[PDB]
Design a protein around this ligand. Structure first.
Ligand code: POV
Ligand code: POV
Ligand code: POV
Ligand code: POV
Ligand code: POV
Ligand code: POV
Ligand code: POV
Ligand code: POV
Ligand code: POV
Ligand code: POV
Ligand code: 3FD
Ligand code: DU0
Ligand code: CLR
Lengths: 1105, 82, 91, 92
């Protein structure tokens, strides 16, 4: 059948017939009038059945021969005289009119359906999600009216209570009862609002208009709101999203809905509210009017097991006005005050007139309701009852139903409502147990509800006690919440490619992920001996810093709102923000590169850049407070983050705004000096003190106190304890500023020689000038092999892959290799002794030198770039060569568009020759640079320098060249002037940032360099290899300075969050709106007090007469 | 529409054909010109507009291979029925 | 326009109707021009379609690309791209 | 102590709030033992507890050691004598 509905759900049709009561309507021909009018006691008359079996009985006179023994007339039994079949009416209502064409779903099932099959319909078949609340609205059965005051408020909270909790509203569906005003509340307060409420309406099929219109299989129904005055039935309301229409077999009568509805309430309250929680989906009953069937229903619920509470609304109709009335005059449980029988029966006799016996009967039904006063809520809309029915509907389930504070909290957790938990579960004087709070935390973390994690920490949860191994090991192994498919992939990589099927994640495996994601020499606390030991054992399992471990969890699970929350709790705030930037950045890179599912890398990089911006904004806060302590914050060993450093973590993530912040640049400037005080010295004296060593003793240095924020070597720090003479020489030659100039003077004296060598004749054997040059380039290359081995990271292929990621290290490799190719050819050649340059091998070697020299001038940009101003312009050149590339590809096309016709028109009689490759490209390029070749244009002219080139067609070339230069200069050169001038500012801004970033790697490279330059560096090597075989900088803090520094960081995260709010709360946009939202409330309170004075005037006339 | 008018029931041929033929409201002098173009240059004096003629305008205005529902066999057939 | 469905399609047809009416009204020398009025009417609907495509695109990029290319079946088996290209609607 | 909470006792300007209590009546006496030791003290209002909890937002505490445990009383001398000892100091 290709439909679960057709196979399972069943209709009902009165196959048998039973005529109406007795009476022929009028009109003597008794036989005719019988078949014409007479209803079946089914509910439909004889000609509506059609009931093919009964049809061959319709002809006789009907089914069932005549008088039929009046016992057997009433023997109508829906179980006996009515038949099932694969249903006809299930599809989609397409409400025509209204607006937007609101679209609902329906079905025509039998009341013989089992209760579970309806839950199988809503969820599996109609594709609905199981809710966290059900609101069963009973009330008016006949169309009524509400004060537009009382209308809109119930439409504020019945919505808001159903949006947040993903609730189902079970109505009657028919547009005559509560469903009208429930349905209207959907209208005014934007039921869509990007979050539709799954409003269901259960009605019986026998009483609804347009039954035929809803017939068909998966058919879109042209159903309309045509309230014909001649109609007798009800119209399906528009704004209800779903409908269940019981097929009682009869037509016309009500009744065959109340079973299914109550059984659906059971069938939902017998479902787990959420896989993590062990309650059932609660149910609440809401009331807007009522007759006897309603207040009887109210009694049922209070009697039920489990008891379903009730919310009555004073000011809405017959019952609800009464149920608040009788309830207000009542006491603790079960009473009327001594003289109230006369008054209350009169209200019954007036409010719903049955009269003095059915009043007293239903009055006794009202007694047993008021007995269970504890479950019923009487939210009265008059002034301020139960704080805005939202609270009342939701808090009503948190009343005398014996549910302990745990069960009270966990339900507000599933709903994701803290305002309830704050104001109604953490009420003054609550009876909390030992593990209830901790257990609710484990549920909030896994379900990713930060606002309860906040609430529980505030209300007494210590995350040191709640962070054991199995818990935090469980937290990674959860599908009960927002999970990361990226994590299980990262685990497969570190595990050599294997993944056993069950595989509960462990913490030693998370450690291998973080070590992989942070890279280099990072070593997590999960892979150490202390942890691996106690791990196999499981006070001693409590993680002294848990919020360092849940910040990683939140980030490996891609739970940002949890991450930013768990970040601002604890200490080491910048460090946690800079690790987090590196985790996501690596996850983004792996997620991008790894081809597993849809990318998710745009999400992770933004998460990285969010934490990377926090760290910068903190560093600015620290820096504006105390510049000296802020520089210490950059360089202290962390001891919880693998003995790393906040700079080292920012550099690790290529986080340029932190490295280009004016604190790092202020520190890097102070490491550049060393012990020297270059505030009260000058570069004249540093250079002179290099060439005149004894002048090292007459320039000023820094004390141990100015050097307290500056990281140092072990030896450098020991020599601050003592300033003697031999300490002032160590302090000088080991400064990065001194190593620099001491290398520039050697490098400038290098080029002066190597320029001299290349311009002067070169005999068979190298001159003294040339041996000094080979010594430099040789010893300089040993220096570079030393740089690679002592780089940072023990993984060799990374030492190499990072060293060739630098322009001037790649060119040195080319410049050094090329030079010894040149020296080999120069030196190892059979000299001729008649004329050099009869040896093509000596030529090659010399010409390699004459080109190798170019690498060594361009390298002066590495030394010029140490300056503030020069450096950025150096860095621009690369960024600008990259961006002009395509204007220059067009300029090269225009070149060959011209050079090939020019050469072909002027030189026809050419054989194939490699000169053709030159001549199509040579002169047209030199035209770009001012050379017009004025006397080679018009080769047939008298002033021509190419009169032999005159021939047929050569008059075309001046036209071609006129076009050529127009295109080059007047378009393509000025487009390029236009390019640069309109891209200068942002390339100059990036280039200041990139220069300030490379200034880290530059300066920190010079702590590592030896003292002596690259002719004399070999001494420093031989001394180092002699002291390596026979036998970086840290910020040393004493114990009282690590103390005062952590106090400094905490104080600056306070000022940060404070000033961030004070800026926001003091802004224009935020004061306009709080002004706006109070003129809301006041304007209501003036008309309220404007209404009261109207009720003060009435008293004046009252007390007057 | 909000108060219960279904535009599926209220959109018959004579109505929607009447709607084009109205001077009781803001009208377009451009339309009667567009109709003259598609009609080979002729315009009988009375000339209550029809829907096959609006179709030729839209096919002219949308250009290319656009073919409106007013020039198809299904519509031209039922049009002569009503 | 905002009642019914096929919202982009109706906005991109409308941009093409007015755009053609503007062109004919400009070229055709019948009365005062009224072409400045029709082109603004065209560019008004052409902007609605773009602003919807941005809305669709920010929701689901895969389904938004389907919206561009499904046959319409009420608009001569055309396509929302083909209608935007037809009106030289570059945004 | 709550007034410190709502109206932002830090606010970049902490009030030096002191609380003088006797040692004999405060819970978690053992947790506060040790020399210059950071104490893992918590707000665990055990229903089975009989003593009081030190409040959080007070910046300082002086806990008189009366030698006894359980009884109140050995605070009122020091407190009044501290008031004297401060009112006998030049305000500026
Ligand atoms: C005596 C006269 C003789 C010579 C005359 C002619 C001399 C001609 C002169 C040529 C100019 C010489 C300078 C080249 C500058 C390269 C720029 C650079 O660094 O880019 C990038 C290199 O990224 C890498 O990963 C590079 C790794 C391999 C080294 C580059 C090989 C180029 C060799 C050319 C050999 C030519 C020598 C020809 C001669 C045999 C920057 O790094 P990155 O992008 O960050 O990459 C790392 C990260 N990533 C991989 C994830 C991206
Ligand atoms: C960190 C990375 C960056 C640093 C990179 C460092 C590595 C740089 C790598 C450098 C090596 C490059 C190649 C060297 C030359 C060989 C090729 C050549 O042209 O040979 C010639 C010389 O043949 C000889 O026999 C004479 C060689 C004399 C020694 C000079 C090279 C050794 C120094 C190397 C010091 C390097 C180590 C530096 C310190 C580590 C052969 O030709 P010929 O015999 O002259 O003529 C033959 C024809 N005829 C006889 C008819 C005329
Ligand atoms: C017909 C002639 C045509 C061409 C002619 C010449 C032009 C040829 C040009 C080739 C350069 C190709 C590199 C493109 C730039 C890439 C980006 C960049 O910053 O690169 C590098 C810097 O920039 C440079 O290295 C630029 C070097 C050329 C600039 C001019 C040199 C002046 C000195 C010579 C004067 C000699 C004069 C006399 C000689 C006899 C470094 O960056 P990176 O480490 O690679 O990182 C990539 C950036 N990223 C991470 C943002 C992605
Ligand atoms: C779409 C944009 C429009 C472009 C604008 C219009 C384009 C300009 C149009 C210019 C008109 C053309 C001039 C040539 C006229 C014929 C020459 C001739 O008959 O004889 C000459 C041949 O000389 C040649 O054949 C050379 C051709 C002229 C090259 C002009 C290049 C354009 C430079 C300017 C471009 C900028 C123009 C600025 C505009 C104000 C010489 O005479 P002869 O008797 O053969 O020989 C005598 C012997 N003798 C040579 C030894 C002495
Ligand atoms: C702005 C104001 C400018 C003035 C306008 C007036 C125009 C007047 C037009 C004059 C053309 C006719 C005069 C020459 C008659 C033919 C004989 C002759 O002398 O031929 C000469 C070549 O020149 C030619 O053969 C003709 C050149 C035609 C093109 C001229 C430009 C067209 C207008 C512009 C459009 C440009 C397109 C622009 C695109 C952007 C040959 O003489 P030679 O070169 O000395 O070689 C002789 C030797 N040999 C036999 C060995 C080869
Ligand atoms: C600005 C620099 C800053 C610091 C730089 C770093 C420190 C580096 C400093 C200096 C380099 C060390 C070597 C110096 C050798 C030169 C002396 C000399 O003439 O030797 C040579 C001696 O011989 P001669 O008398 O010339 O006679 C010809 C010799 N011949 C037979 C071999 C042809
Ligand atoms: C690697 C780094 C080393 C450190 C640098 C310091 C140590 C290096 C210092 C010196 C080493 C050289 C020894 C000199 C030997 C004297 C003979 C001589 O050269 O006579 C020449 C005159 O010219 C000179 O005397 C000057 C030659 C050097 C010019 C460059 C020096 C500037 C750099 C250093 C100083 C400034 C430093 C600037 C920066 C602050 C005559 O020419 P010839 O070739 O002898 O004659 C044969 C000609 N033939 C081949 C055509 C037939
Ligand atoms: C990776 C580095 C290694 C590079 C490869 C190894 C290079 C070493 C290669 C060769 C070493 C051996 C040299 C002799 C070759 C055989 C020919 C011969 O002997 O004599 C002939 C030389 O003919 C030539 O071509 C000489 C020049 C060739 C050197 C090319 C170097 C470029 C390498 C790239 C640059 C490095 C850039 C590197 C940057 C990364 C003739 O000369 P003759 O003997 O005097 O006889 C006179 C002839 N006559 C009778 C006609 C008058
Ligand atoms: C032997 C006799 C003894 C004398 C010899 C010595 C002579 C003098 C030697 C060199 C000339 C410059 C001297 C002045 C230095 C001023 C100090 C200064 O501010 O330095 C700066 C520049 O530091 C440099 O190193 C700039 C480059 C100079 C060395 C290499 C030459 C490159 C240019 C060759 C071009 C070829 C042109 C061709 C022309 C022929 C660095 O310090 P800063 O700017 O304060 O740092 C700012 C950053 N901050 C704000 C973040 C902190
Ligand atoms: C279109 C703009 C206005 C111009 C209109 C008027 C011009 C119309 C167009 C072209 C005029 C062509 C005739 C002029 C030459 C006459 C003189 C002559 O003989 O010259 C030379 C030959 O010249 C030729 O043989 C011409 C080649 C054919 C023309 C090719 C198209 C060029 C223009 C592109 C197409 C046009 C569209 C371009 C769009 C801008 C000289 O050769 P020779 O005679 O053998 O000399 C003896 C040599 N000896 C002594 C060394 C042995
Ligand atoms: N203090 C200080 C200080 C001293 C020197 C420097 C120079 O920095 C050198 C490094 O600067 C790097 N670099 C450079 N180098 C600039 C440059 C290099 C070579 C030439 Cl021929 C030129 Cl025309 C310009 N440009 C970069 C870029 N656009 N993006 C990323 N990195 C770039 C490059 O790897 C090179 O090795 C920077 C700062
Ligand atoms: C898309 C771009 C279109 C233009 C262009 O790039 C691509 O197309 C290329 C094709 C090249 C030619 C191919 C083959 C040869 C044969 C050779 O014959 C040696 C003979 C003898 C020496 O005497 C041996 O001993 C001489 C050179 C020549 C003609 C090339 C010239 C350059 C040309 C035109 C190039 C030009 C820049
Ligand atoms: C085609 C061959 C055979 C002939 C020589 C090629 C030319 C173009 C070569 C020879 C020497 C080369 C230069 C050698 C050194 C440097 C310094 C480097 O930082 C940028 C490239 C630059 C500036 C090279 C550019 C290209 C260059 C000029």
């Amino acid at each position: 059948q290709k439909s679960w509905i057709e196979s399972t759900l069943t209709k009902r049709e009165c196959v048998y017939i039973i005529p109406s009561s007795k009476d022929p309507h009028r009109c003597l021909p008794g036989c005719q009038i019988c078949q014409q009018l007479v209803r079946c006691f089914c509910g439909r008359l004889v000609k509506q059945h059609a009931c093919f079996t009964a049809s061959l009985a319709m002809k006789y006179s009907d089914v069932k021969l005549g008088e039929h023994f009046n016992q057997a007339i009433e023997e109508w039994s829906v179980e006996k005289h009515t038949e099932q079949s694969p249903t006809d009416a299930y599809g989609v209502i397409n409400f025509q009119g209204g607006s937007h064409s609101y679209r609902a779903k329906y079905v025509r099932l039998s009341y013989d359906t089992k209760p579970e099959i309806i839950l199988q319909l809503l969820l599996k078949e109609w594709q609905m999600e199981l809710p966290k609340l059900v609101i069963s609205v009973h009330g008016g059965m006949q169309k009524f009216e509400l004060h537009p005051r009382i209308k809109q408020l119930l439409g504020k909270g019945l919505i808001k209570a159903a949006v947040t909790t993903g609730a189902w509203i079970l109505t009657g569906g028919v547009n005559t009862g509560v469903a009208k005003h429930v349905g209207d509340a959907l209208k005014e307060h934007a039921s869509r609002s990007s979050r539709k409420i799954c409003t269901i309406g259960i009605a019986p099929w026998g009483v609804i208009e347009n039954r035929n219109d809803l017939v068909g299989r998966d058919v879109v129904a042209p159903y309309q709101t045509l309230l014909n005055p001649l109609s007798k039935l009800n119209v399906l309301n528009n704004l209800h999203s779903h409908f269940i229409l019981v097929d009682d077999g009869t037509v016309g009568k009500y009744g065959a809905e109340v079973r299914l509805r109550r059984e659906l309430e059971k069938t939902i309250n017998q479902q787990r509210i959420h896989a993590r929680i062990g309650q059932g989906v609660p149910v609440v009953a809401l009331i807007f009017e009522g007759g006897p069937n309603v207040i009887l229903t109210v009694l049922e619920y209070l009697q039920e097991s489990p008891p379903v509470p009730v919310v009555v609304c004073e000011g809405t109709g017959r019952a609800a006005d009464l149920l608040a009335y009788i309830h207000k005059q009542t006491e603790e449980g079960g009473n009327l005050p001594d003289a109230a029988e006369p008054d209350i029966i009169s209200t019954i006799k007036k409010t719903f007139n049955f009269g003095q016996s059915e009043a007293v009967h239903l009055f006794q039904t009202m007694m047993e309701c008021m007995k269970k006063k504890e479950l019923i809520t009487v939210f009265h809309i008059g002034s301020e009852d139960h704080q805005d029915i939202d609270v009342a509907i939701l808090t009503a389930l948190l009343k005398g139903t014996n549910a302990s504070a745990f069960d009270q909290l966990i339900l507000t957790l599933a709903w994701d409502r803290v305002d309830i938990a704050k104001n109604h579960v953490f009420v003054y004087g609550q009876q909390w147990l030992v593990g209830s709070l901790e257990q609710a935390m484990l549920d909030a973390l896994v379900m990713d509800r930060v606002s309860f994690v906040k609430l529980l920490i505030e209300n007494g949860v210590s995350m040191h006690k709640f962070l054991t191994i199995p818990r935090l090991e469980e937290l990674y192994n959860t599908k009960q919440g927002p999970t990361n498919p990226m994590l299980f992939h990262l685990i497969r990589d570190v595990k050599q490619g294997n993944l056993p099927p069950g595989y509960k994640i462990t913490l030693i495996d998370i450690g291998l992920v973080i070590e992989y994601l942070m890279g280099g020499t990072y070593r997590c606390t999960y892979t150490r001996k202390r942890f691996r030991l106690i791990y196999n054992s499981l006070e001693t399992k409590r993680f002294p810093y848990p919020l360092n471990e849940l910040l990683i969890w939140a980030c490996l699970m891609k739970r940002q709102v949890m991450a930013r929350f768990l970040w601002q709790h604890g200490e080491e705030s910048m460090a946690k923000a800079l690790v987090a930037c590196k985790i996501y950045r690596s996850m983004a890179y792996e997620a991008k590169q790894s081809d597993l599912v849809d990318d998710t890398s745009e999400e992770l990089k933004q998460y990285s850049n969010d934490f990377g911006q926090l760290a910068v904004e903190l560093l600015e806060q620290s820096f504006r407070q105390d510049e000296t302590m802020a520089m210490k914050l950059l360089t202290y060993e962390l001891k919880n983050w693998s003995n790393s450093t906040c700079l080292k973590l920012a550099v690790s993530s290529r986080l340029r705004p932190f490295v280009a912040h004016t604190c790092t640049q202020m520190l890097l400037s102070d490491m550049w000096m060393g012990r020297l005080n270059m505030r009260k010295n000058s570069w004249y004296k540093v250079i002179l003190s290099i060439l005149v060593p004894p002048a090292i003793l007459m320039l000023e240095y820094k004390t141990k106190a100015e050097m307290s924020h500056i990281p140092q070597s072990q030896d450098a720090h020991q020599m601050t304890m003592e300033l003697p003479i031999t300490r002032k020489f160590y302090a000088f030659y080991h400064a990065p500023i001194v190593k620099f100039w001491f290398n520039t003077l050697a490098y400038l004296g290098f080029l002066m020689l190597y320029t001299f060598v290349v311009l002067v004749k070169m005999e068979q054997l190298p001159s003294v000038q040339e041996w000094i040059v080979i010594a430099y380039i040789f010893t300089y290359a040993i220096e570079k092999v030393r740089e690679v081995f002592m780089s940072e990271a023990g993984k060799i292929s990374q030492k190499i892959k990072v060293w060739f990621s630098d322009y001037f290290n790649v060119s040195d490799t080319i410049a050094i290799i090329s030079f010894f190719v040149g020296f080999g050819l120069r030196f190892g050649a059979k000299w001729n002794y008649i004329n050099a340059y009869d040896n093509h091998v000596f030529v090659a070697g010399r010409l390699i030198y004459c080109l190798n020299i170019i690498f060594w001038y361009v390298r002066l940009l590495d030394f010029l770039a140490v300056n503030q101003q020069a450096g950025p312009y150096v860095m621009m050149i690369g960024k600008m060569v990259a961006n002009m590339f395509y204007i220059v590809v067009i300029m090269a096309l225009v070149l060959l568009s011209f050079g090939v016709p020019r050469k072909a028109i002027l030189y026809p009689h050419e054989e194939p020759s490699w000169s053709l490759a030159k001549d199509i490209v040579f002169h047209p390029y030199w035209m770009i640079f001012g050379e017009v070749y004025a006397y080679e244009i018009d080769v047939c002219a008298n002033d021509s320098t190419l009169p032999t080139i005159c021939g047929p067609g050569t008059w075309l070339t001046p036209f071609l060249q006129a076009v050529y230069l127009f295109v080059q200069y007047i378009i393509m050169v000025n487009l390029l002037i236009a390019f640069f001038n309109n891209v200068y500012l942002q390339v100059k801004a990036i280039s200041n940032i990139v220069w300030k970033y490379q200034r880290y790697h530059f300066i920190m490279a010079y702590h590592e360099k030896p003292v002596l330059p690259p002719p004399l560096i070999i001494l420093s090597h031989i001394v180092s290899l002699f002291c390596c075989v026979c036998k970086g900088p840290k910020l040393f803090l004493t114990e009282e300075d690590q103390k005062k520094l952590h106090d400094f960081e905490e104080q600056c995260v306070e000022m940060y969050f404070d000033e961030k709010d004070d800026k926001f709360n003091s802004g224009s946009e935020e004061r306009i709106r709080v002004t706006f939202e109070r003129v809301e409330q006041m304007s209501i309170q003036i008309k309220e007090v404007g209404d009261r004075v109207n009720y003060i005037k009435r008293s004046l006339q009252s007390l007057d007469s």
